[PDB]
Amino acid sequence: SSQIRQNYSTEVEAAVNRLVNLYLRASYTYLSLGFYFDRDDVALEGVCHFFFELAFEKFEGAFRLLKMQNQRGGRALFQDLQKPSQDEWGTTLDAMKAAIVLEKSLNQALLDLHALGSAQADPHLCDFLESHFLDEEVKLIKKMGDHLTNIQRLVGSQAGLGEYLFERLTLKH
Amino acid sequence: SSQIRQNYSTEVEAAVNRLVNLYLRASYTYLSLGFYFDRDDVALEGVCHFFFELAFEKFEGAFRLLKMQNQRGGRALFQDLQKPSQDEWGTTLDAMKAAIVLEKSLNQALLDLHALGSAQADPHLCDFLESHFLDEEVKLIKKMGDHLTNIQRLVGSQAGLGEYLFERLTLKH
Amino acid sequence: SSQIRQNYSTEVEAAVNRLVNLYLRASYTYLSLGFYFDRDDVALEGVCHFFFELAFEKFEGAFRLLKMQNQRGGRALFQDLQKPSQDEWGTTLDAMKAAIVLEKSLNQALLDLHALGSAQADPHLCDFLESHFLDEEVKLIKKMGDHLTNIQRLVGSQAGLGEYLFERLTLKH
Amino acid sequence: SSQIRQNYSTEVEAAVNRLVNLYLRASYTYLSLGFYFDRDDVALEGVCHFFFELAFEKFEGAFRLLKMQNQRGGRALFQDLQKPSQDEWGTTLDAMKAAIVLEKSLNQALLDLHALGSAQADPHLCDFLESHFLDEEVKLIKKMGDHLTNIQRLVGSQAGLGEYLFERLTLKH
Amino acid sequence: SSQIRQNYSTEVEAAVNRLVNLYLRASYTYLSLGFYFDRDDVALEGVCHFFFELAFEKFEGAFRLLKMQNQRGGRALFQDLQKPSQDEWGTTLDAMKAAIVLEKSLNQALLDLHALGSAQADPHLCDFLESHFLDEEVKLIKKMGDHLTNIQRLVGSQAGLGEYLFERLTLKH
Amino acid sequence: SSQIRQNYSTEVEAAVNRLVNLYLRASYTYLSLGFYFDRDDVALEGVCHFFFELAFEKFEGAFRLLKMQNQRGGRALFQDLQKPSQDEWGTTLDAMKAAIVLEKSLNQALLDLHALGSAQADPHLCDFLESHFLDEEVKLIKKMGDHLTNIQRLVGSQAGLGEYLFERLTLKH
Ligand SMILES: CCN(CC)c1ccc2nc3c4ccccc4c(=O)cc-3oc2c1
Ligand SMILES: CCN(CC)c1ccc2nc3c4ccccc4c(=O)cc-3oc2c1
Ligand SMILES: CCN(CC)c1ccc2nc3c4ccccc4c(=O)cc-3oc2c1
Ligand SMILES: [Cl-]
Ligand SMILES: [Cl-]
Ligand SMILES: [Cl-]
Ligand SMILES: [Cl-]
Ligand SMILES: [Cl-]
Ligand SMILES: [Cl-]
């Protein structure tokens, strides 16, 4: 087989392909989230833009993973992309809760892959994840947690008002 | 009669004149809406500016229609302009509801005229409507629907607060 | 009623609303004049542009009047807008004669309103009219009189030639 | 045959080739018109330039049609180009009358082709015509009608004077 | 249901959702094509970049469709995304053949949707497709056909040489 | 007849008209050549652009001839334009061979006309041809001969490869 492959296990190759699938699924989920908040009967522009930026971020993550797979001499293999878990995403709070669950699952998949790289003595893979993924994910989950807290603080007894204010004064538009 | 007229039915000519009347009536309605929200006892600058921009837009629509009537060799005929349906327009919500009703009526008149053009095999008219009117109208009705949803979300139990916040944080001033 | 209204009679309020109606009717008349001279079988661009500029001027006059009505704490009330007095406007001479008749009627309405303001000891209204309307109107009627004289001088025995030359060499295109 | 052709009827292909022939014939007619008005014994520069600009416009129309034929996977087929209908074109009025007749024939050919596209459910062809041809033609015929009216107004009893003035004060030089 | 929806059939809404699925599948196919040509054992940079640009184009198409669905008051519904039809894509010729098959299928889906819009008297949908999709697709299929012809001309008896030269001298890098 | 004509024979006048016909026929031939190489199943952009530039050059030649005819007081007379000699033009080699045959025929017509001018003692005509036509033609035929030699050198046993390389590395795109 490969004229470049070196120190790159079949286990890591497969796991990288699985992780691509997870990132692309996450991108799709965020595309659905974005268009839901674009509905005339939802109409929260800042929320919309927040989730579309994440759709792009997750697609970029997948792309970098696929680039690395080729740089290492593995073979990119694509699978079916499962549709997102919901067709409607409820409130901004419901959506941000679903997004943090999603991110925590991606982070766990990154950690799992890092551990596999470590067991396989694959330092390039370990560094790749550390340099492009693990801190980005920590930073994103922190920001989502910050948002959750602010959204929650605003529910009070006037939920609509709080939802509008969060979109207007925290999220970008 | 006309040295330029070609493929331009009397039915379309008349319907174009009727549509001009509808656009000018819509412009007038929006002028009334704008000055109501300019009242010292209403005083919602952003709402005022939103409806004045629409008064100008609807006048522009009428002007383009009249330009096209002449380009086709039809004869512009003006009728009495009915005053707007109300002298006072209630809340921002009441006003935005009235505006979307108005826009839906204009859109239906555009669709009706497009259908007439299609039946008469008048592709220039059909393209004119598609290129300058139908998508502008879809975009406007979408924006009004977005606004309605945000206004509605803000009523809650503190209607005045919500009305102020919508004007301050969504509409332009 | 009004928390701002001071020294502003019901008579002036009503007369201001009537004057708005007159200005908007004048704007409409000028819109009709403009599109007539835009006809392929009339085709006098300079005349067209002259009357469209007046349509805009008269609309601006109405707008300023409505702004002032609100600044004084009166209530803008709109009525039906009568269509213009003609559907076709004849020669440039016929049109300019009709325009000066129209302007003289507006000027008389301004003078009448000024007199009412004076009788009611309403100096703000009197100054408003003097500052934004009376001299603009004198200047416009003078310019129309100048035009009439030039158009008349050009009729001679070659009316078409004179009509073309006036449009080409006096009016803007 | 063609590796790209899709939804593109033989009838439309042939009609497009015929329309190319019509446009190129129109270009040739305008070339003849231009050089006639360039004669020392005619010498109307503005008229000359007006018809040369149209020769170029009609050639561009043909070129776009031929580009589209290839984009659709049809085969451009050229036929003999009939010489223009006259060798001398009379007055500016005679020439502008001949030009509007010509344009009306081109417009009818466009409408005929649009109808064929519609019957064949060929929306690309229908849009192509609407986007690049039908409104350009309406605008041109309107401008020619405007010119005819001005030329006619200037004949009066001093035809030479009127012909000179039209060329000098309306047409570009 | 919807406060904005007007003249927008359930049939069109569903078909738009189906078309989104087709565009996203096409984007995925092009992502796979791109990474295959990025393999160290394939290594055709220009081919890689050509297919990645198409992945982005097809994603943009899907996005515009979803935007329009919301502008019309339809509801975006996502389905599972089928993986691409192949894991390895053979030669540049094999790949470009597969890409033109794919594009022809998308074009047929656009035409089908346009026909449905026409039957339903939905001119906004018909114009949307004409303005953003049908000509882009014709232009792309023409370019692919051009490429196919050039690739085919280069096979001769030295296929590797021809594949290299096409990538180096036609495709962008 | 003519108030400007001087030293300008009927024989030269007629021959100039014939030469215009030849130039316009040549322009048409080059238009056909250009669109053939624009076909999806030919697809040689550089060849396409080479022949379109010549279509424009030959049209310019005709235009200059017609300008000169009027400057001399002759009368431009147009005839039917024969369609080009072929509907399909074969290889780049076949096309360039046909183009040099065409150019040699134009050059001979120029030389013939120069000789007629010389016999008629018409130095203005002789200079006009020398200054705007004879050297342009020599330069063009030299360039075509250069191209023929390069195309011929590239046929070898891999004709497609050679045809691609010539288009890519010699002709402009
Ligand atoms: C409202 C019924 N009527 C009287 C028939 C209106 C309404 C609105 C108008 N708005 C404009 C306008 C708006 C923006 C920029 C330029 C212009 C203009 O030149 C003339 C106008 O004339 C109007 C007449
Ligand atoms: C009149 C019948 N024939 C010969 C078939 C014409 C007529 C007009 C033409 N006008 C152009 C032209 C005009 C403006 C800018 C570029 C071009 C050009 O590149 C080629 C032309 O070729 C023409 C051929
Ligand atoms: C391939 C299947 N999936 C997951 C559903 C894709 C494919 C391609 C995509 N391309 C973009 C994209 C491309 C250019 C510029 C911006 C963006 C963007 O913001 C989001 C994207 O998201 C994508 C998802
Ligand atoms: Cl599968
Ligand atoms: Cl009446
Ligand atoms: Cl009433
Ligand atoms: Cl023949
Ligand atoms: Cl499912
Ligand atoms: Cl003949």
Residue numbers in the entry:
A (entry chain A), B (entry chain A), C (entry chain A), D (entry chain A), E (entry chain A), F (entry chain A): 1 to 173
Article sentences:
As a scaffold for aromatic cluster design, we chose ferritin as a protein cage platform with a 12 nm outer diameter and an 8 nm inner cavity, composed of 24 subunits. Herein, we present the construction of an aromatic cluster with an artificial molecular binding pocket at the two‐fold symmetric interface of ferritin and explore its ligand‐binding characteristics. We developed a system that uses ligand binding as a driving force to induce and propagate changes in the orientation of multiple aromatic side chains.
The resulting mutants were named Fr‐F2 (Fr‐E56F/R59F), Fr‐F4 (Fr‐R52F/E56F/R59F/E63F), and Fr‐F6 (Fr‐E53F/E56F/E57F/R59F/E60F/E63F), where i in Fr‐Fi represents the number of newly introduced Phe residues per ferritin monomer (upper). NR was positioned between two F59 residues, forming π–π stacking interactions in an F59–NR–F59' configuration. The quantum yield of Nile Red (NR) significantly increased from 0.50 in 100% methanol (MeOH) and 0.38 in a 50% MeOH‐water mixture to 0.88–0.95 upon encapsulation within Fr‐F1, Fr‐F2, Fr‐F4, and Fr‐F6. Furthermore, NR's fluorescence lifetime extended from 2.87 ns in organic solvent and 1.26 ns in aqueous‐organic mixture to 5.23–5.75 ns within these ferritin variants.
